[PDB]
Amino acid sequence: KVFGRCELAAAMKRHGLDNYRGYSLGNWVCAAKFESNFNTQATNRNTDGSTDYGILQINSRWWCNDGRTPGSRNLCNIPCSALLSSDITASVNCAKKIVSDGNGMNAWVAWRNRCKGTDVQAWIRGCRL
């Protein structure tokens, strides 16, 4: 599923991401935009042989099981395919875990490089939230 911007903002806000670990909703929308282009089905291979999955490009190195990342963990206790669903519940639950485990949203390289230090609440401007 490719979300609209406000459509994703509203879903993220319902699952409790607005201000989660102090990151305003616009941060999460911005991250999704640049990580996945709002596409739940996005996948991208990494140099170490892991893959990033879903709307927030969650890594098989640590967070989910994809069956081809030998030696990896599955800290969200899910198949990586669960992160590609039209229902973002699993991605959101796993992202909460990720953002809590030390480096905050710097875990998302596109957020660091394209959202951090920008006017991120522009990403929710116009939305009826």
Residue 87 counted as an annotated binding residue: no
Q: Cα(123)–Cα(97) distance, rounded to whole angstroms?
A: 23
Catalytically annotated residues? 35, 52
> Degrees (nearest 5) of the Cα angle 103, 19, 53?
55
Q: Are 54 and 48 within 8 A, CB to CB? A: no
Which domains, and CATH codes, for the chain?
5-122 (1.10.530.10)
**What resolution (Å)?**
1.1
Q: Cα(37)–Cα(85) distance, rounded to whole angstroms?
A: 15
Q: Cα(31)–Cα(48) distance, rounded to whole angstroms?
A: 22
Give me 77's structure tokens.
Answer: 């206790």
- Measure Cα distances from 3 to 71, 73, 87, 102, 125 in Å: 33, 29, 11, 29, 16
Question: Structure solved using which method?
Answer: X-ray
